[PDB]
Amino acid sequence: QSMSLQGKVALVTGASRGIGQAIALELGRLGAVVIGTATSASGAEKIAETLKANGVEGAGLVLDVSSDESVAATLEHIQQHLGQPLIVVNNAEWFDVVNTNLNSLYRLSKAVLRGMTKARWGRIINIGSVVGAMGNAGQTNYAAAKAGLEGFTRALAREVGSRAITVNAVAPGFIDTDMTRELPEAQREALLGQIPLGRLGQAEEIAKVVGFLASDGAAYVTGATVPVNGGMYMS
Template sequence: MSDTDPQGGSPTGRSVLVTGGNRGIGRAIAEAFLAQGDRVAVTTRSGGAPDGALDVRCDVTDPAAVDAAFAEVEAAHGPVEVLVANAGITQDTLLLRMSEDDWSSVIDTNLTGSYRLAKRAAKGMLRLRRGRIILISSVVGLLGSAGQANYAASKAGLVGMARSLARELGSRSITTNVVAPGFVETDMTGVLTDEQRDTIKAQVPLGRYAVPAEVASAVTWLASDDAGYVTGAVIPVDGGLGMGH
């Protein structure tokens, strides 16, 4: 899946786009692709891409912004060959307290945003007759979580979307897969109290949180030639928390 430099004939890496790549899991994913020698673009809302990555400002809830971001990436790196849809938000609250905006903002960012990204990426991939689409879901999308009906619904929706796209795009050598992380050491989990952290760890068979690089390893594998016959899969990186789902 590598391009070739017409001057010297050496691989120049693939054009990779990672959304929400300025921190946490997204940053680790971007850094892993950079370490492989790929040409990586990262979308953020406020900047802060890893060194070596193209920093593209994009709000995935804005269709025009998504199209403009792809145009910028394509001009710099060529058509996107690997899309990692990672950008996501939470608005946690119990159902009876959940406002219409709490619901719609999470669905629009996490699920509809991923639809916009996949649709735009697929245009270039269909012309190339190859590609990798990887959607970042969550163990919560499979298990559910009290106070996260909106987030769980958005993350579960990614699975149905990915499997539908796997059927639509497979004949053009485009794979679509899902990575479902469990609890990961990031800024989002760093705000939990020690008691909350201990309660969560007690539910995880491996007895610990993941580090972002462990999620990134699953993503880079799905994007590799070694995973060329894997599509429509949900790969859990959750320490065993979601077994059987």
């Protein structure tokens, strides 16, 4: 009725598995034409099979977000064949890590903005990292990137707002993915002891939110980091 993204071309990066794939399908299912990407050809192929499998119009694709060449090429390629994407979704020593992420977020976001600017409409949606038990160190990085995301996101939202382009972030919590499904029994129950709802979040649950923010309904929402974590907040 009104959660229709019909006739809108979405771009989901890192969409071969878990959260990213869940975002891809959810966007399609809301009528989006959907371009999922991965770092490899094998990956990009897989994505397409999965789209066709669920009736979603679109295309798998190979993209290295760290490399300008890839980005410039990928977009150019996308534009000609499918159209210009207006819903763009970024999915993916603490210093190096965080520094690299935000530069990428930047690189890509910058690239896609020319297109959103012409159309005077856009959605950028940035996905946080999942919580993962690498100990004391795990707590440091999680918080560090989550801090970067929040800040970054809000800044970029301020810089584009005049052109009716929202920018928002989603901060997953302890999510049921391939990564989590094989962590030690201890670090699981310890961590569930910290989540008020007492379960992991399913990828779909992230997707749904992503889908929301994409919608026209959530058009006065910009610069915001929606926490999806069943109540476990870390700061």
